[PDB]
């Protein structure tokens, strides 16, 4: 029940989020065009 | 005017696409929820 | 003794496994040619 394991999981997810961001930015892919149309 | 440079660019973009795919899959992030709602 | 830390480790290893998979797929590298010959 370490309420720090959750933190490092959140950190890893944040790292992955950032990586996804720049990947998409490279691909000229909008991650929200679906949301804009919605 | 090498119509193979375009190919390797397409290959790199495909690699990046795949990487983005598995990244999102890790993040439990739907890339089409916007499109579903739309 | 959190039997969830092991889980997130397994998740990270699965992410890395997948990334390795698509990397190899890009490199046209068989990860089992050794095993086939064996």
Swiss-Prot record, chains A, B, C:
Recorded superkingdom: Eukaryota
Family recorded in the similarity comment: Belongs to the thiolase-like superfamily. Fungal fatty acid synthetase subunit alpha family.
Function: Fatty acid synthetase catalyzes the formation of long-chain fatty acids from acetyl-CoA, malonyl-CoA and NADPH. The alpha subunit contains domains for: acyl carrier protein, 3-oxoacyl-[acyl-carrier-protein] reductase, and 3-oxoacyl-[acyl-carrier-protein] synthase.
Quaternary assembly: [Alpha(6)beta(6)] hexamers of two multifunctional subunits (alpha and beta).
Name of the protein this chain belongs to: Fatty acid synthase subunit alpha
Lineage: Eukaryota, Fungi, Dikarya, Ascomycota, Saccharomycotina
Shown part of the complete sequence: 322 to 360 of 1885
């Amino acid at each position: 029940d370490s309420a720090a394991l959750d933190a490092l999981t959140a950190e890893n997810k944040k790292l992955a989020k950032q990586q996804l961001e720049v990947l998409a930015r490279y691909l000229q892919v909008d991650l929200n065009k679906g949301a804009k149309s919605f």
